[PDB]
Enzyme design. Structure first.
Site, PDB file in Angstrom:
ATOM      1  N   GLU A   1     -36.556  41.928  46.419  1.00 24.42           N
ATOM      2  CA  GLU A   1     -37.581  42.057  47.445  1.00 24.42           C
ATOM      3  C   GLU A   1     -37.038  42.078  48.868  1.00 24.42           C
TER       4      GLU A   1
ATOM      5  N   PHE B   1     -48.560  28.229  38.403  1.00 23.26           N
ATOM      6  CA  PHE B   1     -47.307  28.956  38.260  1.00 23.26           C
ATOM      7  C   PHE B   1     -47.146  29.999  39.367  1.00 23.26           C
ATOM      8  N   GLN B   2     -45.981  29.986  40.008  1.00 21.61           N
ATOM      9  CA  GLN B   2     -45.651  30.904  41.094  1.00 21.61           C
ATOM     10  C   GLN B   2     -46.609  30.865  42.274  1.00 21.61           C
TER      11      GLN B   2
ATOM     12  N   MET C   1     -13.525  35.138  58.174  1.00 18.84           N
ATOM     13  CA  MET C   1     -14.779  35.239  58.907  1.00 18.84           C
ATOM     14  C   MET C   1     -15.133  33.960  59.677  1.00 18.84           C
TER      15      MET C   1
ATOM     16  N   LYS D   1     -55.092  37.389  43.019  1.00 22.22           N
ATOM     17  CA  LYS D   1     -55.284  38.299  41.892  1.00 22.22           C
ATOM     18  C   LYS D   1     -56.752  38.599  41.565  1.00 22.22           C
TER      19      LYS D   1
HETATM   20  C1  FAD Z   1     -45.705  33.254  29.947  1.00 24.73           C
HETATM   21  C2  FAD Z   1     -45.236  31.748  30.002  1.00 24.73           C
HETATM   22  C3  FAD Z   1     -45.272  30.963  28.764  1.00 24.73           C
HETATM   23  C4  FAD Z   1     -44.850  29.567  28.749  1.00 24.73           C
HETATM   24  N1  FAD Z   1     -44.918  28.892  27.528  1.00 24.73           N
HETATM   25  C5  FAD Z   1     -44.541  27.570  27.421  1.00 24.73           C
HETATM   26  C6  FAD Z   1     -44.627  26.892  26.129  1.00 24.73           C
HETATM   27  O1  FAD Z   1     -45.039  27.460  25.102  1.00 24.73           O
HETATM   28  N2  FAD Z   1     -44.215  25.531  26.108  1.00 24.73           N
HETATM   29  C7  FAD Z   1     -43.745  24.859  27.268  1.00 24.73           C
HETATM   30  O2  FAD Z   1     -43.388  23.661  27.225  1.00 24.73           O
HETATM   31  N3  FAD Z   1     -43.671  25.494  28.461  1.00 24.73           N
HETATM   32  C8  FAD Z   1     -44.047  26.826  28.585  1.00 24.73           C
HETATM   33  N4  FAD Z   1     -43.967  27.474  29.840  1.00 24.73           N
HETATM   34  C9  FAD Z   1     -43.460  26.644  30.986  1.00 24.73           C
HETATM   35  C10 FAD Z   1     -44.626  25.835  31.585  1.00 24.73           C
HETATM   36  O3  FAD Z   1     -45.438  26.727  32.315  1.00 24.73           O
HETATM   37  C11 FAD Z   1     -44.175  24.677  32.533  1.00 24.73           C
HETATM   38  O4  FAD Z   1     -43.407  25.229  33.661  1.00 24.73           O
HETATM   39  C12 FAD Z   1     -43.276  23.598  31.824  1.00 24.73           C
HETATM   40  O5  FAD Z   1     -43.726  23.376  30.420  1.00 24.73           O
HETATM   41  C13 FAD Z   1     -43.384  22.307  32.576  1.00 24.73           C
HETATM   42  O6  FAD Z   1     -42.507  21.344  31.832  1.00 24.73           O
HETATM   43  P1  FAD Z   1     -42.334  19.830  32.219  1.00 24.73           P
HETATM   44  O7  FAD Z   1     -43.713  19.237  32.270  1.00 24.73           O
HETATM   45  O8  FAD Z   1     -41.397  19.259  31.245  1.00 24.73           O
HETATM   46  O9  FAD Z   1     -41.648  19.722  33.615  1.00 24.73           O
HETATM   47  P2  FAD Z   1     -42.205  19.542  35.086  1.00 24.73           P
HETATM   48  O10 FAD Z   1     -43.211  20.562  35.389  1.00 24.73           O
HETATM   49  O11 FAD Z   1     -40.955  19.494  35.930  1.00 24.73           O
HETATM   50  O12 FAD Z   1     -43.001  18.235  35.129  1.00 24.73           O
HETATM   51  C14 FAD Z   1     -42.301  16.965  34.896  1.00 24.73           C
HETATM   52  C15 FAD Z   1     -43.306  15.856  35.027  1.00 24.73           C
HETATM   53  O13 FAD Z   1     -42.527  14.655  34.841  1.00 24.73           O
HETATM   54  C16 FAD Z   1     -42.635  13.823  36.011  1.00 24.73           C
HETATM   55  N5  FAD Z   1     -41.342  13.153  36.247  1.00 24.73           N
HETATM   56  C17 FAD Z   1     -40.169  13.619  36.886  1.00 24.73           C
HETATM   57  N6  FAD Z   1     -39.209  12.708  36.900  1.00 24.73           N
HETATM   58  C18 FAD Z   1     -39.711  11.566  36.258  1.00 24.73           C
HETATM   59  C19 FAD Z   1     -39.182  10.269  35.957  1.00 24.73           C
HETATM   60  N7  FAD Z   1     -37.932   9.916  36.310  1.00 24.73           N
HETATM   61  N8  FAD Z   1     -39.999   9.360  35.279  1.00 24.73           N
HETATM   62  C20 FAD Z   1     -41.283   9.750  34.929  1.00 24.73           C
HETATM   63  N9  FAD Z   1     -41.898  10.956  35.164  1.00 24.73           N
HETATM   64  C21 FAD Z   1     -41.074  11.855  35.838  1.00 24.73           C
HETATM   65  C22 FAD Z   1     -43.005  14.776  37.115  1.00 24.73           C
HETATM   66  O14 FAD Z   1     -43.608  14.160  38.259  1.00 24.73           O
HETATM   67  C23 FAD Z   1     -43.953  15.738  36.415  1.00 24.73           C
HETATM   68  O15 FAD Z   1     -45.305  15.282  36.298  1.00 24.73           O
HETATM   69  C24 FAD Z   1     -44.360  28.875  29.990  1.00 24.73           C
HETATM   70  C25 FAD Z   1     -44.325  29.660  31.235  1.00 24.73           C
HETATM   71  C26 FAD Z   1     -44.747  31.069  31.272  1.00 24.73           C
HETATM   72  C27 FAD Z   1     -44.682  31.820  32.607  1.00 24.73           C
HETATM   73  C1  TPP Z   2     -27.317  35.791  56.294  1.00 21.41           C
HETATM   74  C2  TPP Z   2     -26.226  35.413  57.289  1.00 21.41           C
HETATM   75  N1  TPP Z   2     -25.298  34.480  56.974  1.00 21.41           N
HETATM   76  C3  TPP Z   2     -24.306  34.126  57.844  1.00 21.41           C
HETATM   77  C4  TPP Z   2     -24.238  34.745  59.116  1.00 21.41           C
HETATM   78  C5  TPP Z   2     -23.093  34.317  60.076  1.00 21.41           C
HETATM   79  N2  TPP Z   2     -22.127  35.444  60.336  1.00 21.41           N
HETATM   80  C6  TPP Z   2     -22.286  36.174  61.422  1.00 21.41           C
HETATM   81  S1  TPP Z   2     -21.075  37.435  61.560  1.00 21.41           S
HETATM   82  C7  TPP Z   2     -20.379  36.881  60.051  1.00 21.41           C
HETATM   83  C8  TPP Z   2     -19.178  37.566  59.450  1.00 21.41           C
HETATM   84  C9  TPP Z   2     -19.426  39.067  59.387  1.00 21.41           C
HETATM   85  O1  TPP Z   2     -18.403  39.678  58.463  1.00 21.41           O
HETATM   86  P1  TPP Z   2     -18.348  41.192  58.166  1.00 21.41           P
HETATM   87  O2  TPP Z   2     -19.656  41.623  57.690  1.00 21.41           O
HETATM   88  O3  TPP Z   2     -17.242  41.444  57.243  1.00 21.41           O
HETATM   89  O4  TPP Z   2     -18.026  41.869  59.568  1.00 21.41           O
HETATM   90  P2  TPP Z   2     -16.815  41.884  60.621  1.00 21.41           P
HETATM   91  O5  TPP Z   2     -17.179  40.929  61.650  1.00 21.41           O
HETATM   92  O6  TPP Z   2     -15.614  41.556  59.795  1.00 21.41           O
HETATM   93  O7  TPP Z   2     -16.841  43.278  61.052  1.00 21.41           O
HETATM   94  C10 TPP Z   2     -21.068  35.817  59.564  1.00 21.41           C
HETATM   95  C11 TPP Z   2     -20.675  35.130  58.267  1.00 21.41           C
HETATM   96  C12 TPP Z   2     -25.242  35.733  59.432  1.00 21.41           C
HETATM   97  N3  TPP Z   2     -25.294  36.390  60.597  1.00 21.41           N
HETATM   98  N4  TPP Z   2     -26.198  36.030  58.498  1.00 21.41           N
HETATM   99  C1  TPP Z   3     -38.248  37.530  42.474  1.00 20.93           C
HETATM  100  C2  TPP Z   3     -39.260  37.951  41.426  1.00 20.93           C
HETATM  101  N1  TPP Z   3     -39.861  39.150  41.507  1.00 20.93           N
HETATM  102  C3  TPP Z   3     -40.775  39.563  40.581  1.00 20.93           C
HETATM  103  C4  TPP Z   3     -41.120  38.709  39.498  1.00 20.93           C
HETATM  104  C5  TPP Z   3     -42.171  39.222  38.452  1.00 20.93           C
HETATM  105  N2  TPP Z   3     -41.547  39.429  37.102  1.00 20.93           N
HETATM  106  C6  TPP Z   3     -41.648  38.469  36.210  1.00 20.93           C
HETATM  107  S1  TPP Z   3     -40.852  38.872  34.693  1.00 20.93           S
HETATM  108  C7  TPP Z   3     -40.393  40.420  35.395  1.00 20.93           C
HETATM  109  C8  TPP Z   3     -39.582  41.425  34.609  1.00 20.93           C
HETATM  110  C9  TPP Z   3     -38.363  40.743  33.994  1.00 20.93           C
HETATM  111  O1  TPP Z   3     -37.393  41.814  33.542  1.00 20.93           O
HETATM  112  P1  TPP Z   3     -36.028  41.488  32.863  1.00 20.93           P
HETATM  113  O2  TPP Z   3     -35.278  40.590  33.724  1.00 20.93           O
HETATM  114  O3  TPP Z   3     -35.357  42.752  32.554  1.00 20.93           O
HETATM  115  O4  TPP Z   3     -36.415  40.739  31.503  1.00 20.93           O
HETATM  116  P2  TPP Z   3     -37.214  41.098  30.146  1.00 20.93           P
HETATM  117  O5  TPP Z   3     -38.565  40.607  30.333  1.00 20.93           O
HETATM  118  O6  TPP Z   3     -37.071  42.576  30.012  1.00 20.93           O
HETATM  119  O7  TPP Z   3     -36.419  40.364  29.168  1.00 20.93           O
HETATM  120  C10 TPP Z   3     -40.857  40.529  36.669  1.00 20.93           C
HETATM  121  C11 TPP Z   3     -40.612  41.771  37.514  1.00 20.93           C
HETATM  122  C12 TPP Z   3     -40.458  37.421  39.438  1.00 20.93           C
HETATM  123  N3  TPP Z   3     -40.685  36.510  38.473  1.00 20.93           N
HETATM  124  N4  TPP Z   3     -39.551  37.096  40.416  1.00 20.93           N
HETATM  125  O1  2HP Z   4     -44.033  36.288  36.061  1.00 22.34           O
HETATM  126  P1  2HP Z   4     -45.143  37.205  36.431  1.00 22.34           P
HETATM  127  O2  2HP Z   4     -46.446  36.549  36.142  1.00 22.34           O
HETATM  128  O3  2HP Z   4     -45.058  37.521  37.880  1.00 22.34           O
HETATM  129  O4  2HP Z   4     -45.036  38.460  35.642  1.00 22.34           O
END
Ligand code: FAD
Ligand code: TPP
Ligand code: TPP
Ligand code: 2HP
Ligand code: FAD
Ligand code: 2HP
Ligand code: 2HP
Ligand code: K
Ligand code: K
Ligand code: MG
Ligand code: MG
Lengths: 541, 550
Positions: B58, B120-121, B484, B170
């Site tokens: 993006e 999510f997202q 750099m 959406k």
């Molecule tokens: C198309 C799709 C399908 C999916 N299908 C599944 C599926 O089938 N099964 C699945 O599991 N997931 C699935 N997911 C993922 C799901 O959406 C969640 O992101 C994920 O399950 C969240 O898992 P989690 O609760 O373990 O972790 P988290 O979301 O990180 O939540 C952790 C929880 O634990 C708590 N916590 C953190 N540290 C501690 C601590 N030290 N002590 C006590 N509590 C604590 C947090 O506050 C929080 O409430 C899917 C996602 C997509 C996009």
């Molecule tokens: C995203 C990002 N990270 C770090 C910097 C800091 N920075 C500015 S100039 C530079 C080095 C540029 O190197 P290059 O592209 O090889 O050009 P040169 O100066 O060698 O012609 C850096 C790391 C920046 N401007 N943007």
């Molecule tokens: C930065 C970002 N842009 C767009 C999306 C939306 N998106 C979710 S899954 C997907 C396609 C994934 O393609 P690929 O990595 O080839 O995996 P496949 O599902 O084919 O295994 C897209 C575009 C995202 N999750 N993150």
């Molecule tokens: O992960 P998606 O929902 O953006 O396809």
């Protein structure tokens, strides 16, 4: 007032350096820039730290996340002002959604220049407010130690998460002239209600006949979590199911394992949960992907609650998430590991649950979750690649860590791989950031040098950050990059020659087009010393 | 009836969006698919009324949009999904915000009913992008969609152009419009004043017009002059009439043909020494569309001596910038170009002691066969080769030393031909900006003068160039030998540095991506490769190993 002078005479950069040591930091991911120069030079020139350089700051952020999830330590990121800071926003948002400890340090224009539209000046504190647990801008060098310690404390307590510390150039380049309060240089009521809840929870577990342990990410936020979980499962003979983020916390080869829960988990796991009289939620947030329609989730647990003999017990660290989705009979506030520890001695040892496990094992062989096999001489199915690679990986006997991209391959990796060890499944669940795989794998490899690190990636996801390929070579991380390429409404994207790309980046490239060559390539892939990329042409989505 | 509009009743948000883009004269959209933006994505992606350009990340979409806008004069439209899709365009928005580039970013969002439930997202995009957009909003319902779109385009293209963001839930874009909506909300807020407005301006125009004629002056022109089609045209007329020396900021390059004898070229510290002096030896500084960057005047206190006495005119558009950094004598608020025409008449036609004084100062300010190749030489030779094709040439760059060298040693002649990140200085800008510029000017020869480190930031867009059919010429001045990061240097001027990034084989990379790759290691092969580089049909990458001690 207790004053300290040990830092008097040092520059912000050296103080920063010293603070990292006190925080047990030996790894830092970042990219140079003018505004962060004072700190960058200090860290980059010290042999006390391993500075990992990505090709894009986003890489640094995701590498830090991989590092944290595989090590248990916070991921430290160091970037410059403006574009340097804005390029780490996605990783912070990602870490924020998955509760990953990360401390981001961003260079900033001089304090005297703040709010004058100076070159590369950005309201980073404002931009990252919604994607950090906390942030701040250090106003003077005397304040530096304090902010650093606070940053690490917040990032690693409660639900872990990312914090940002904005560092003005004049502040880090300055020399500390005055002594500072000793306290600020050293790291780091209801106590009864919680102890009561632990007793109540122990009573419910002892009372239950068909209990189920629903475990999530929280159990991995303490080194002993997985051990105590197994202890509880064995002591009271309780079947264990995990969320996606919980994979690895419980050995899936254990007879008491139900594997993954949810609309994409095993039928058996979903059944045990719908039939249980007691659900013990440990470190999970009841995501709708896991529960499905909430009003119809765990009907037998609800009945038990209604009749006063069961229900839902929730071990949660954040008060905000208690009773948020589902009403719970008991909530044990705080760290899950700590509380399971305090509760163990109160759990009655159960010799067996023959009936409960009979019903469970009956469902297991009654609903053997299996995909659609492959017809001889046809396109290779991805699930097959995963089931096989898992076997090959396992045969090496090495500790294996798996990272993934986002998409269909992500779920397949979760489902068809056999999870056994904690901190081995590193995938972006909360935000689902494509491009996560490669950099997270690099960071994980840096955290566990002896581990075999595999990135099960998708072709589109891999394109997002493939430039980090050269970063892997430069950092000496022998990551194994697996690309399940399923590219033939319908957004057909043009892919580069992955094998030639790998070679151009400095790695070994391998490709598989036919089933008759998969096994050999998988073995070579895993056996190759050094970073290697293997593309497997797979059957369309 | 002009009251209510019923033309959208029955359509989905996606089709409405589609229709609104047409009313806004949008034919190009840069973006990446995702679940939350699906309703709109499908509508745009399936219509042959729009050219949808797909990047690999993006951020690429955002920078491509910036390049497109700067080369075309039209706003850059970006379409991305929720969460990571939105957060990946933050840098481009911050970049566009700093350089005042018109950009309209549309981000998919979780359903309105899910907002604030950690879905999510789900990301507080409106909050995240508040400081890097002129304005943003979250459409709450499909009836509101046309309104927000029109407002977005109006704000992005008025005053000082800039980026705006429109968060699209959406459920809102997937819904079907059931009720009619006021015509006012569906008609583009395009662009008359009163005697009270005409007088106030005209007043300052004359006061300024006087201090001008009654003086012996220098034109300090910046990016502001390029925000009007007939902007540079009137800049020449005003320089011819009263014979005034024209100097430009980095972002002004191309607004005035550097061939004309009155060109003082670039100003600022990394500018031509002649200009910096002329800005002192001048009695009146006529600031036109510039913002006196501290990089253009370090010694704010020692800035403009001869001009600090007999009265520093300022043709600014944003009052918030007038007398906010430097101190002006006269202020001609409003669009620079327009206010120049409204002052062409009150200008008395024509100076000789002015030139002589400069010509001398100017007349007062290479590589040996066998040694390393100098960047400056590459740029000068490329400028000549490019010029010999007679084609319209557009140049984009990365960030670093090569950026300043490109600005200095290239000969600027046409407006909207230098596209570089100045305000935020975003490395990785070159390639994607060049792709967007190429899409905006299909017949133009587009060259990206990039640095090796900068190029690594976004090199994945290489395949995007091939897919979009944009024949961009990517020049990589690889000086990877010098670090750099400077540790220390010499006063009288060697540079000792650290932090070397391991570059990939750029030529093999190009071939892997689908382009032609070329490399230059010795001076004796530079000329031929430069010619082949510019002559190659299709996208091509040329790496020139350059001296790390320059
Ligand atoms: C198309 C799709 C399908 C999916 N299908 C599944 C599926 O089938 N099964 C699945 O599991 N997931 C699935 N997911 C993922 C799901 O959406 C969640 O992101 C994920 O399950 C969240 O898992 P989690 O609760 O373990 O972790 P988290 O979301 O990180 O939540 C952790 C929880 O634990 C708590 N916590 C953190 N540290 C501690 C601590 N030290 N002590 C006590 N509590 C604590 C947090 O506050 C929080 O409430 C899917 C996602 C997509 C996009
Ligand atoms: C995203 C990002 N990270 C770090 C910097 C800091 N920075 C500015 S100039 C530079 C080095 C540029 O190197 P290059 O592209 O090889 O050009 P040169 O100066 O060698 O012609 C850096 C790391 C920046 N401007 N943007
Ligand atoms: C930065 C970002 N842009 C767009 C999306 C939306 N998106 C979710 S899954 C997907 C396609 C994934 O393609 P690929 O990595 O080839 O995996 P496949 O599902 O084919 O295994 C897209 C575009 C995202 N999750 N993150
Ligand atoms: O992960 P998606 O929902 O953006 O396809
Ligand atoms: C290492 C490095 C070195 C640099 N060296 C130099 C240097 O030597 N010299 C130099 O000039 N720059 C240099 N820059 C770039 C510098 O930082 C600024 O980005 C640039 O000078 C700003 O130029 P500008 O004022 O013309 O444009 P802008 O910053 O875009 O400002 C334009 C001004 O014009 C106003 N405006 C916009 N549209 C209109 C309109 N239609 N009518 C009236 N007013 C309008 C705006 O509101 C604003 O106040 C350097 C950058 C880097 C990273
Ligand atoms: O070198 P920078 O960080 O000032 O661009
Ligand atoms: O370039 P160095 O300092 O990383 O060796
Ligand atoms: K499994
Ligand atoms: K020039
Ligand atoms: Mg795919
Ligand atoms: Mg370089």
């Amino acid at each position: 007032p207790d004053m300290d002078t040990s830092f008097v005479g040092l520059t912000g950069g050296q103080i920063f350096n010293e603070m990292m040591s006190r925080q047990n930091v030996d790894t830092v991911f970042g990219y140079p820039g003018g505004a962060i120069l004072p700190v960058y030079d200090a860290i980059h020139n010290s042999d006390k730290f391993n500075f990992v350089l990505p090709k894009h700051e986003q890489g640094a952020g995701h590498m830090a996340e991989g590092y944290a999830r595989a090590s248990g330590k916070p991921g430290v990121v160091l970037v410059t002002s403006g574009p340097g800071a804005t390029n780490v926003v996605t990783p912070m948002a990602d870490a924020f959604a998955d509760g990953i400890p990360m401390v981001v340090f961003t260079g900033q224009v001089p304090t005297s220049a703040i709010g004058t539209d100076a070159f590369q000046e950005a309201d980073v504190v404002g931009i990252s407010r919604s994607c950090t647990k906390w942030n701040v801008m250090v106003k003077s060098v005397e304040e530096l130690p304090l902010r650093i310690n606070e940053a690490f404390e917040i990032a690693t307590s409660g639900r872990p998460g990312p914090v940002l510390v904005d560092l003005p150039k004049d502040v880090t380049a300055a020399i500390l002239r005055n002594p500072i309060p000793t306290k600020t240089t050293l790291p780091s009521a209801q106590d009864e209600f919680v102890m009561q809840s632990i007793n109540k929870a122990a009573d419910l577990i002892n009372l239950a006949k068909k209990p189920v342990l629903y475990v999530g990410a929280g159990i991995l936020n303490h080194a002993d979590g997985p051990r105590l979980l197994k202890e509880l499962s064995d002591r009271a003979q309780i079947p264990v199911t995990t969320t996606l983020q919980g994979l690895g916390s419980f050995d899936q080869e254990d007879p008491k394992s139900l594997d993954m829960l949810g609309m994409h988990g095993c039928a058996t796991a979903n059944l045990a949960v719908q039939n249980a009289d007691l659900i013990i939620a440990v470190g999970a947030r009841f995501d709708d992907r896991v529960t499905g329609n909430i009003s119809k989730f765990a009907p037998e647990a609800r009945r038990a609650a209604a009749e006063g003999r069961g229900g839902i017990i929730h071990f949660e660290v954040s008060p905000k998430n208690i009773n948020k989705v589902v009403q719970t009979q008991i909530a044990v506030e705080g760290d899950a590991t700590t509380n399971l520890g305090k509760m163990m001695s109160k759990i009655f040892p159960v010799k067996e649950r023959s009936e409960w496990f009979a019903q469970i094992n009956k469902w297991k062989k009654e609903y053997p979750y299996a995909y659609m096999e492959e017809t001889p001489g046809s396109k290779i199915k991805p699930q097959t690649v995963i089931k096989k690679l898992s076997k090959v990986a396992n045969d090496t006997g090495r500790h294996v860590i798996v990272t993934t991209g986002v998409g269909q391959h992500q779920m397949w990796a979760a489902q068809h791989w056999t999870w056994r060890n904690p901190h081995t499944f590193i995938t972006s669940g909360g935000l689902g950031t494509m491009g996560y795989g490669l950099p997270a794998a690099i960071g994980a490899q840096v955290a566990k040098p002896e581990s075999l690190v595999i990135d099960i990636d998708g072709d589109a996801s891999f394109n997002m950050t493939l430039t980090e390929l050269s970063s892997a070579v430069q950092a000496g991380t022998p990551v194994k990059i697996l690309i399940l390429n399923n590219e033939e409404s319908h957004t057909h994207q043009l892919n580069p020659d992955f094998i030639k790309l790998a070679e151009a980046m400095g790695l070994k490239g391998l490709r598989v087009k036919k089933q008759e060559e998969l096994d050999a390539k998988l073995k070579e892939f895993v056996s190759t010393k050094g970073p290697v990329l293997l593309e497997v042409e797979v059957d369309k989505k």
